[PDB]
């Protein structure tokens, strides 16, 4: 056994929060670390976002 191949992969994503821009608007919100806002997805399902 000598031949071993390479396969690229994307193991999930990065959950480290970014930097918060302070905008003087009441509707722009930022969640806690490892927290998600819930939206109704495109196909009538549920999705989570930041």
């Amino acid at each position: 056994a000598t031949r071993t191949l390479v396969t690229a992969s994307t193991p999930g994503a990065d959950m480290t929060p970014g930097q918060l821009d302070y905008t003087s608007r009441p509707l722009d919100v930022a969640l806690q670390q490892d927290g998600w806002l819930v939206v109704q997805a495109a196909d009538g399902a549920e999705g989570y976002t930041r």
């Binding site: 056994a1 000598t2 031949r3």
Partner: protein, 119 residues
């Protein structure tokens, strides 16, 4: 009968050389086909077999009655063929020289006979 028997060993060896080279050329042709195990024959055992019992064919699509054995692969491959090109080209060159040797021996014997007959 006597002359046929005296020239039969080298003639049969040369025919088996031709068939082995056909097999090796088939292996070289299928070298990039995925899922092709390389085939080869044991020259000595098949030569003795053809010697004791005459040549035979499966049909006659026709093919010889030789046993097509599988070559042991050297290193693995994802496509799934065991045709290792170094082995194929070494066996091809060796079979080439041995076929030329058979031609030389048979031609020498036939001249060695025309020398006697000629007068």
């Amino acid at each position: 009968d006597r002359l046929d028997a005296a020239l039969r060993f080298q003639q049969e060896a040369l025919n088996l050389r031709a068939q082995r080279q056909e097999i090796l050329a088939a292996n070289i042709a299928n070298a990039d086909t995925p899922g092709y195990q390389a085939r080869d024959i044991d020259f000595a055992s098949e030569l003795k077999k053809v010697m004791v019992r005459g040549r035979e064919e499966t049909g006659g699509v026709s093919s010889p009655a030789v046993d097509l054995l599988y070559r042991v692969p050297d290193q693995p491959s994802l496509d799934g063929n065991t045709v290792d090109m170094d082995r194929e080209r070494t066996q091809f060159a060796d079979n080439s020289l041995k076929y030329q040797m058979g031609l030389t021996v048979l031609g020498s014997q036939l001249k060695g006979m025309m020398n006697v007959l000629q007068g």
